[PDB]
Amino acid sequence: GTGYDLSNSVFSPDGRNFQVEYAVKAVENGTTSIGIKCNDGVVFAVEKLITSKLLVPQKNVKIQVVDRHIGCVYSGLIPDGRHLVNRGREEAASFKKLYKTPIPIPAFADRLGQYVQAHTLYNSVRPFGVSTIFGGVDKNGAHLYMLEPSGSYWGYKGAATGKGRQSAKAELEKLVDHHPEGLSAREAVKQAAKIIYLAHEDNKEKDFELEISWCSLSETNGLHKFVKGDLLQEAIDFAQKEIN
Amino acid sequence: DIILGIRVQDSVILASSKAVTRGISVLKDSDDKTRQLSPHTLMSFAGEAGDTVQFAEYIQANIQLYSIREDYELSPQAVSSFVRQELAKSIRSRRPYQVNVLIGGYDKKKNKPELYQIDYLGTKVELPYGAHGYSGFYTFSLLDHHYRPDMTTEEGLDLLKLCVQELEKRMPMDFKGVIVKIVDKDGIRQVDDF
Amino acid sequence: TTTLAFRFQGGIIVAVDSRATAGNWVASQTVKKVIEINPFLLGTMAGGAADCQFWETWLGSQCRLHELREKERISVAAASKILSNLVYQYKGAGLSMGTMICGYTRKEGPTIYYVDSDGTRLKGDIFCVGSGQTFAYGVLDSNYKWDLSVEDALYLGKRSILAAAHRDAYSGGSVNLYHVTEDGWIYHGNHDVGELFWKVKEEEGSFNNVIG
Amino acid sequence: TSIMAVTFKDGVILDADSRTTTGAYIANRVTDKLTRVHDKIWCCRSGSAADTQAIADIVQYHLELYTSQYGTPSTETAASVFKELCYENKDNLTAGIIVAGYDDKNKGEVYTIPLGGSVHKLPYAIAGSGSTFIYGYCDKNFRENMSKEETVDFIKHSLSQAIKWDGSSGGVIRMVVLTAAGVERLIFYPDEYEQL
Amino acid sequence: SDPSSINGGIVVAMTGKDCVAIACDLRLGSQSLGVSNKFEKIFHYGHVFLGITGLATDVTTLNEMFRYKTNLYKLKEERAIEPETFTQLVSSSLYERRFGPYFVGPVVAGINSKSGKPFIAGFDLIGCIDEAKDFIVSGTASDQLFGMCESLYEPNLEPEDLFETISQALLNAADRDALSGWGAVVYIIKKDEVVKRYLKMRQD
Amino acid sequence: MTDRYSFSLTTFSPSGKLGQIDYALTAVKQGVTSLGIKATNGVVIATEKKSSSPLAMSETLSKVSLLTPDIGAVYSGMGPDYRVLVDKSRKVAHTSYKRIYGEYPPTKLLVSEVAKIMQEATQSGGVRPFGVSLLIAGHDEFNGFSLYQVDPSGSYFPWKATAIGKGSVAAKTFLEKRWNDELELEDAIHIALLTLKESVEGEFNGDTIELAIIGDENPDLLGYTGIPTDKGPRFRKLTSQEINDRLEAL
Amino acid sequence: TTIVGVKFNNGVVIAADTRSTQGPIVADKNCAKLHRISPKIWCAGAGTAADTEAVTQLIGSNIELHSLYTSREPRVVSALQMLKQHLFKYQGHIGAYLIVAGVDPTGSHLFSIHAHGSTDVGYYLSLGSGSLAAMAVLESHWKQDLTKEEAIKLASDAIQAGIWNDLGSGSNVDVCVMEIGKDAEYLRNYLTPNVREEKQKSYKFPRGTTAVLKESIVNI
Amino acid sequence: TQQPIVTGTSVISMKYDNGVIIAADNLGSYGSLLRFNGVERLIPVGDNTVVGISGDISDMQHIERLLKDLVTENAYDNPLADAEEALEPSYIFEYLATVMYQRRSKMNPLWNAIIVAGVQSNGDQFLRYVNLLGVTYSSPTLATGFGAHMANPLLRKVVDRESDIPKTTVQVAEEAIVNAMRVLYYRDARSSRNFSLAIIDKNTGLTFKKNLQVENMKWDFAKDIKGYGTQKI
Amino acid sequence: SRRYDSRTTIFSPEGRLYQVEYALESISHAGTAIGIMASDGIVLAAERKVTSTLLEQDTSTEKLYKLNDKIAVAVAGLTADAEILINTARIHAQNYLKTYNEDIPVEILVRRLSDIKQGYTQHGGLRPFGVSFIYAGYDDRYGYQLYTSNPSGNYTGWKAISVGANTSAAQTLLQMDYKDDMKVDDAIELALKTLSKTTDSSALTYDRLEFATIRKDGEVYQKIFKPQEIKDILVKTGI
Known part of the structure; x- marks a missing residue:
């Protein structure tokens, strides 16, 4: 549908806002991120594509915390x-x-x-x-x-x-x-x-770098924290082991 | 602080003191406390140190701007009505203009002189003779006694001499004489032998 | 403070003292009470030191901008009105100023415009400002002439400030003489009032009531 | 005035006299100084009548707007809304507030918001001109987790003395009992408490 | 100190038999000094008369305001403003500046062109409609006028008898007020004509 | 984020016509018919109430509305525009006239304020004209009973009798034959119903028809007693029972 | 000024005196102090006469517009809220002390609003200089379940106490009775206990007693 | 422009060889009425900072809220917020000093006197003062309000100059603070018998002692005082 | 929003303001208005465009308006737009009286409105006013004056002018019969003769006519003719 997709607030004859639909096409091009709700918290994971070796590992964080208990x-x-x-x-x-x-x-x-x-x-x-x-x-x-x-x-x-x-x-x-x-x-x-x-x-x-984050009542006392060190490596090992 | 004005049959005579005093001493003894608003309209003013000249020059610009715009000279009545409005606007503004003015003019269409007294509040009144502040306390008794509508300019000047002499005699302050200007059908002129 | 500027055949003579006091404590002895707005315009400090110095320094920029646009030197009348208009905008806000905008122009001749914090602006031949002004008037009013030579005019300005310095507690330090001419102002040096008093006393015989 | 709030085993009781005075004159002797800002959150008002009434109206509007969007508020949230108005306008609004409320998780809570605009959580609170005369009595006699009957008897004794000694306090004693069973309003007339 | 007492002046309105009377003194002064003996304080906007007392600058300002407002009213309405409608126009205009008020006491007087019945109304400096069936007073000598009008006034005076009553009330009240006098003007307003009269009175 | 339609969406076409005004007037032509008749002793404004669905309570949607106790209005065109426009008219009747002069505006001045509101939408930036034509009937002590029509363009004219909407051409032809300078209000209601009966296609009863009159003051509707100078509203809605009674005698 | 409101078994009655004073002088002997906010909501104001008249006129306008907007009979509570919020916004500079009473679909109501925006509910109220004198009568004689006649008598008697005992109150008694089921009846000058007596002499001047300088005819 | 209504009394502190000690009583006075007794006027900000506040309690609770916002806003997009990028005492003080001066310049002051006590990442002791006027200064010992006249004379005997800091141990510093608190309870009318004491040590970290109690007071000499002079019995 | 903007205030490739030209074309379809300045007064005449037997001619004042006790205007084009300008003209006339305590000169009032019309023509992005005015007035300076202004903001002084429909025919007829020394009563005839010839209907009748005059107590009066008065003159003039 052309003609109605050059502006953001315009309804098409079908009622569809095409610009918002095109914005979704931008999302579908991004790296996959997931969120899992566990029995006492949430877990966030994002794929960080390694464009080149020159990116320093672990610094280009893509998960964000809001206040102290929300992770985005x-x-x-x-x-x-x-x-x-x-x-x-x-x-x-x-x-x-x-x-x-x-x-x-x-x-x-x-x-x-x-x-x-x-x-x-x-x-x-x-x-x-x-x-x-x-x-x-x-x-x-x-x-x-x-x-x-x-x-x-x-x-x-x-x-x-x-x-x-x-x-x-x-x-x-x-x-x-x-x-x-x-x-x-x-x-x-x-x-x-x-x-x-x-x-x-x-x-x-x-190539990609896995970044995990999560917020659990029992384990973080309800605050949002990143997975790092030993716990991250166990997740990476488990993920590779299942892949292999 | 002396501002006097007398309207005679054919002209308006405005007299204003020459002294300028700032605190302890007299800075100037030849000041002209008047502004020519139009070829046939003159404005004398008195009041606070800076307000008198800032207001007078601001009024003069608007009257000049009107004259150039319509290629027409405002009548003294219209000028006084305009001047009164600005004083009325200011008296209830952030910083009022504490200026008392006399507007003497010759109405070339009615062929009659006109004298208007407006105080810093915006109280416009047309008089045969006017004065501002305490200058009217000493002079009105003489003007009430000697003034007649049909005086000539020469008789009017003779009457101002009496009014000024009384001010010199009884008023404590030394106002260093007066500058006298006459607004006539021929325009504005200054009397130098006064 | 004592600052004077008077007009004469040779231009304008600006004489000022140099004492600044904070109460009875004499904070400084060598205050420069003349602001050199341009090579052609001179200011003068009385009352608010900061207000005079800041705004007459700012006024120089406005005069310079007029030069650049009009390609002609600003008149003293316009320069004093630029300052007078601004000083009026702040009327009641607390500004304290009494200044003479001294300048000499081809179309206008020697001109002194006295501008104060009330918004006043007066053109005159003689002006004195400060605590000791009444003493400066006494000397000027009797010895001032239009036909004064430059040498005699400079002495009269120097002598007038000396009289105010002697009698006024808040005036003294030194006399700064400026002479405004057709090609700008000329600085005629700083004269110490302490040294000048004894020099003047012997040559004139005046101040006979002072032992020494 | 004389306003009071006492937490007890089953909830919280708010209480106040009924007199408002303009000088020596009692403008209204049956005033209701207990204000409902939410279903189970009530406040006692002391100080300027215009300011406290304005604040209570605005707080009720905010908590009503909160409930529609974020669910039922807690007594701490209601006191927080009071603090912002009392603190951000402390130079204008001369208002001292006691906020008491009930929720299932925290049971009864009492928050006092003195003239300065600070918030203090207390087991019991007393404010008003007449409160100064019962500081010693309430401190000696208040106990944690008293029954409703003991708390009402405690409050009746406390206010009867505040009413007795304060000219600007008197009238009937109005109580609001906030518990899981709901909101209950009680009134005690001078013939009931005056001869305690 | 008091703006309403700087310039003096007084206005009185009386009702008669199908006629209204409104009168005022002609003095303008600066406290003790009398400046003008021709400062009229009664203005008409058609068949409705407005007498304004108080600060002379505010009296002049309100005259040009109500001339401005009544002139626009007649252009939009295509009819002259009636005394009752004008009374509310004055009231609202004075209240529009409750916190910047004009120090003036106006007095509305007129005859409704349609119903034909006399109307007079009074005001404070912030616009309280004091509609009275008998008489209205304003100015520095309101105390004198109240007692003077309250005794002389009687209902249903003919236009000739109303002139004697209002003029006598004004002259005797003005004579006992320092800041009022220097002549007086009386308007006798009838459904068909208006008569304006200048009174002889003490010039001190 | 800001409002960026500071320009006028109504502009002159090369032929001189304002496109948006003409289209706004078209929306009125497909609007439901409404008419007004000015009698010697009152004004009657009538319209039919076509319901969106039989489950809709048409009594909750009044096409005839009170602006001032003596002024009433009916519309043809887009319903929502009339609703907001009536809200504006009632407001301006107070802010602009009553709060100043103490009395409600005459019909001519209130119509002018309404016309000013419509004209503003015809020239202000980022707005379309109101797609409604109003028939404003009122009374005032100096001009008597009056009936005005206001168009989307903001132009308003006084009418002895008029009809706007879908059946305006047929209604106006009918009104010309029947109207005369001797009508009483009871006769105007009879003429109004006859004219409206022609336009209506479905049921013609008190529930599908809405009438209002400006006539004698109703002190029983005033709501209080004790002030003789207060005599009551002149605008009155005829209830469905009242209309049904007149239909039996139609 | 003396103003009272008395709620009775089926409505509310508000009464007021009719004297308006400018200091010690009686400017208006028959001022109407009872103002309409809507047909069945009425207000009586003490303190500054202009503000009470002006504040009620503004709120009365908004009540009418809101009533037309909602297509409902105004609530006395709506008048109270808009009235108190308006007064509070001006921090007491609007010196209007008001007793607002009326009947709405939710019953009869009686409130008093102070110049600072504070309000109180009551079964009987009083304002003005005569409030203490009037409240003495209300305290002595008020009782639950007053009939319309008892309330009108009690309200008038309370106003009379202020009239006789207060210098700032006098002349006549204005009464407005608002009952739930019927219209509000404004009894202007319900009682007139202060009718002036005949003067001892007639002061009709003989025509020509006044000296005139000039006479003119004014064009209209 | 405001005035204080409910106020906290003096806060006292001093730096010793390895860290700083700060103490404050748990009282909020409403005039002469000792109204509120549960007020905590020491505000830990991370593991290495303690902010002691005196004066208006309503403004104290406002400052306490600002500090909790710093700790939140610092952790945003800051993976090193726990180490190498955590809030230092110096950063916290400058924020407070800036806020206190900005409010002063608006003539809407925070009627408080604040002492920020902490240990920098490099181990250097931090102890600075700031009041409603924005005036700030540092010293080996700092005291607010009434403690400046009574506590400082006592604390200054232990650490009179910068060279005395390395010679002052935890025990000597703590007993000096505890003794000063007792002296304040003796002679301060608006003081409480209960107080909180915080020790920030570059080795052991922050040690926050709540509900400390004034003890070993001397009153036994009061029995021997009779009348105001001439009285004998 | 840039795509929906019509760019009202722009020049055409040949130096013309498109919307002002189109606004003028709109005015050319409005009812004719004629103004004739006589030796002893001014005559304003206009032809109602909308007409019907059910239209209330008695109070349908839609083309002739009073701005002052001394000035009046005849309107051609959008009636709604005019009333916006009419009210600003009235306020300005009263503002001048309030300030200078004198009646506003006709040219000053005309210049102010023309400045308002010009403003919409140069900035703001809004469409121009589609109204042309004929100002008829009196003042002490120039006596009887007759002006006309159009959407462009340009105004000129005239001795006899017509705006609206059939201006070319109306102007040509005025050129043929206008004599400088003519009286108002002759201007009454000339205005009606000109309208009767340029009218698009079969004949000119009192119901279609707005008519007003300004004439000299020695004071200028304004008379906006009532329908019976117009019917009288139509018989006297012979139309």
Whole structure:
């Protein structure tokens, strides 16, 4: 459908906002990132493609923390994701200043959804070219959400985005089938690494670095922390072992 | 601080003191406290140190801008109405203009002199003879006694001599004489032998 | 403070003292109370030292911009009105200023414009400002003439400040003489009031009430 | 005035007198100083009547807006909203507030917000002009986890003395009992508490 | 100190039998000094008369304001403003500046062109509609006028008898007020004509 | 992010016509018919209420609305524009006139304020004209009963009787034959119903038809007693029962 | 000024005196102090006469517009909220002390609003200089379940106490009775206990007593 | 422009050979009324900083909120927020000193006197003062409010100059602080018997001691005082 | 939003303002308005374009407006746009009286409106006013004056001018019969004769005519003719 896709706020005769649909095409080109909701927290994993050996390992972090209990991972236009996360940090700080409590994840997800959606209202602005998997632990459990360029978001047992989303979603579905009682935080980290490695088979042309993050009540006391050192290497070893 | 004005049959005579005093001493004794708003309109002013000249020169620019714009000289009534409005606007502004003015002019269309007294509040009143501040305390008794509408310019000047002499005699301050200007059908001129 | 500027056949003579006091404590003895706005315009400090120095330094830039645009030297009347208008904008905000904008121009001749913090702007032949102004007037009003020679005019300005320095507690230090001519102002040196008083006393016989 | 709030085993009780005075004159002798800012969050108002009423109206608007968006607030959140208004306008609003509320997780909570705009969580709080006369009595007699009957008897004794000694305090004693069973309003007339 | 007492002046309005009367003194002064004996304080905007007392600068400002407002009213409405409508126009205009108020007390007087009944109304400096069926007073000598008008006034005075009553109330009240006098002007307003009269009075 | 339509979307075409005004007037032509008739002792404004669905409670959607107690309006065209435009008209009736002069505006001045609102949309940047034509009927003590039509362009004219909307051409032809300078209000209602009966295609009863009149003051609708100078609204909606009673005698 | 409101078994009655004073002088002997906010919501104001008239006129405008917007009879609570929020916004500079009473679909209401924006609910209220004198009568005689007649008598009697005992109150008694089921009845000058007596002499001047300088005819 | 309503009394501190010690009482006074007794006026900011605040409690709770925002905003996009990029005492102080001066220049001061005590990453002791006017200074011993007149004379006997810091041990510094707290309780009317004490050591880290108690007070000499002069019995 | 902008305020490749030319074309389809300046007054006449037997001619004042006690204007083009300018003209006339305490000169009032029209023609991106005015007024300086202004913001003084439809025919007829020394009563005839010839209808009748005059108590009066008055003169003039 041409003619109606040159502007951001225009409905096509079918009611479809094409520019937002084109923004989704930007997301589908990004590196695959997933989020797994465990029985007491959430786990985030992102594939970081190694463009060249000259990138210093472990410095180009792509998972972001908001306040202290929300972690955000996104795929698509990385600058757009940072713009969205910068707003979330402002929204989270504003909520804490006025209400004194850390912003609830369902409340935070709405704050971001209103912002992302507001970018589809006017033709003087462009839609976000990122789908953001975000979540954390709040007063009433763990929450995992996923935004879209249109501003739509839902709660997920496990979310996947980026180029390997179709591959990753297959293994996320297997996790919920095999573990309906709830997956443990430590096992979720190992499974998160395995899913990213499997999803990378859609990007075999280039090497990648796995980055994991997670926020569990029992293990981080409800705060968002990165996987590093021994725990990261066990996940990498497990992911390679299953691949081999 | 002396500002006097007397309207006679054919002209308006405005007299204003020459002294300028700043605190302890007299800086100048030849100051002209008047501005020619139009070829036939003259404005005498008195008040606070800086407000008098800033206001007078600001008014003169607008009257000059009107004259050039319409190629027409505002009547003294219109000029006084314009001047009163600015004083009325300022009296209730951030920094009011504490300026008292006399506007003497010759209306070339009615062929009659006109004298208007406006104080810093914006109280415009047309008088046969006017004065601002305490200068009217000493002079009104003489003007009420001797003034007649049909005086000639020479009789009007003779009457100002009496008014100025009384101010010299009884007023404590030394105002260093007066500069006298006459607004007539021929324009504005200054009397030098006064 | 004591600053004077008077007009005469040879131009303008600007004489100022150099004492700055913080109460009765004499903070400085060698304050420069004349701002050299341009090679052709001279300022003068009285009252607010910072207000005079800052705005007359700023005024020099405005005069320079007029030079660049109009390609002609700004008149003293315009220079004093630029300062007078600005000083009026801040009226009531706390500015303190009494200054003479001395300059000599072809179309206008020697010109002194007295500008103060009230927004006043007066053209005159003789002006004195500061605490000791009444003493400077006394000497000037009696000995001032239009036909003064440059040598006699310089002495009269030097003598007028000496009289104010002697009698005024807040005036003294030294006398700074400036002479404004057709080709700019000329600095005629700094004369110490302490040394000048004894020199003047012997040559004139004046100050007979002072032993020495 | 004389306002009071006491946590007890089953929840929290807010209490206050009913007198408001403009000088010596009692403008209204049956005033209701207990204000509902949310279903189970109530506040006691002391100080300027105009300021406290304005703040209570704004806080109720904020907590109503909070509930529609972020679920039911806690008593800590209600006190936080009070603090922002009382603190960000401390030079204008001369308001001292006692906020008490009930939620299942934390049971009864009491927050006092003195004239400065600070927030203090307390087991019991007393404010108003008449409170100064019962600082010693309340401290000696307050106990943790008293029953509803003991707390009401404790509050009746406390306010009867605050009413007795303060000219600007008196009238009927109005109580609001916040518990899991709901909100209960009690009123005690001078003939009931005056001869305790 | 008090702006309403700097310039002096007084205005009084009375109602009669199908006629209204509004009168004022002609003095303008600067406290003790009398400046002008021709400063009229009664203005008309058609068949509705407005007498404004108080600060002379505000009296002049409001005259040009209500001339501006009533002139635009007649262009949009294509009819003259009635006394009742004008009374609310004055009231709102004075309240629009509650915190920058004009130090003036106006007095509206007129006859409704349609109903034909006399109308007079009074005001404070911030626009309280003091609609009275008998008489209205304003100015420095309001105390004198109240007692003077309250005793002389009687209902349903003919236009000739109303002139004697209002003029006598004004002259005797002005005579006992330092800042009022130097002549007075009386308007006798009838449904068909208006008569303007200048009174002989003490010039001290 | 900012509003970037600071330019006018209504502009003159090479033929001199303003495209958006003409299209706004077209939307009125496909609008539901409404008419007004000015009688010697009142004005009647009528329209039919076509319901979106039989499950809709048409009583909740009044096509005839009160602007001031003595002024009422009906529309033809886009319903939403009339609703917001009526809200503006009621507001400006207070802010611009009543709060100054103490009394409600006359019909001519209120129509002018409404026309100014429509004209502003016809020249201001980033807006389209209102797609409604209003028939504003009112009364005032000096001009009496009056009926005005206001167009999307902001132009307004006074009418003895008029009809706007889908059946305007047929209605106006009918009104010309029937209208005369001797009509009473009871006769105008009869003529209004007859004219409206022609336009309506479906059911013609009190529920599918909406009438309002400006007539004698209704002190029973005033809501209070004790102020003789207050005499009550002149604008009155005829309830479905009242209309049905007149239909039986139609 | 003396103003009282008295809630009775089926409505509320507000009464006020009619004297307006400029210091010690009685500017208006028959000022109407009861103002409409809507047909069945009425307000009585003490303190500054202009602000009470102006504040109610502004709120009355907004009540009418809001009533037209919502297509509902105004709530007395809406008037109270917009009235108190307006007064609070001006931090007490609008010196309007008001008793707002009325009937709405939710019953009869009686509030008092102070110049600073504080409000209180009550079954009987009083404002003005005569409030203490009027409240003495209300305290003595008020009782639950007053009938319309008892309330009107009590309200008028309370106003009379202020009239007789307060210098700032006098002349006549204005009464407005708002009952839930029917219209509000404004009893202007309900009682007129201060009718002036006949003067001892007639002061009709003989025509020609006044000296005139000039006479003119003014064009209209 | 404001005035204090509920206030905290003096905070005292001093640096010793290996770190710093800071103490403050747990009282909020409302005039002469010792109203609130649970106020904690020492605010740990990370593992190497403690911020002691005195004066208005309402502004103290505002500053306490700003500090918790620093720790949050520092960890944003900062993988080294725990080591090599954590907040130092010097960074925290400059933020507070800037805030306190900015509020002063707006004539809306934070009516507080703050002592930031901590140990830098390189081990150097940090101890700086800042008040509502934005005035800042450093010393081996710092005290706020009433403690500047009574605690500083006592602490300065232990560390009178910079060269005395390496000669002062934890025990000597701690007993000096504890004795100063007792002296303040003796002669300060707005002081409490309970206080908190924080020790920041470059080796053992932060040691925060809550609910410390003023002990070993001397009153037995009061029985021998009779009347105000002439009285004998 | 840049794609939807019509670029109102731009020049054509041959130095013409497109929207102003189109606005003028719009005015050429409006009812004719004629102004004739006589020795003792000014005559403003206009032809109503919208007409019907159900239209209220008695109070349908849509082309002749009063700006002042001394000035009036006849309007051709968008009636809605005119009333916006009419009210600003009225306010300006009163602002001048408030400031200078004198009636505004006609040229000053005309210049202000023409400046308002020109503003929309040069900046702001909004469409021009589609109205042409004929100002008829009096002042002490120039006496009776007759001006016309168009959407472009240009205004000129005239002795007799017509705007709206059939200006070419109306102007040619005025050229043939206008005598400088003619009285108002002759201007009454000339205005009606010219309209009766350029009118697009079969005949000219009182219902189609707006008519006003300005004439000299020695004070200038404004008379906007009521329908019966217009019907009277039409018989007297012989139309």
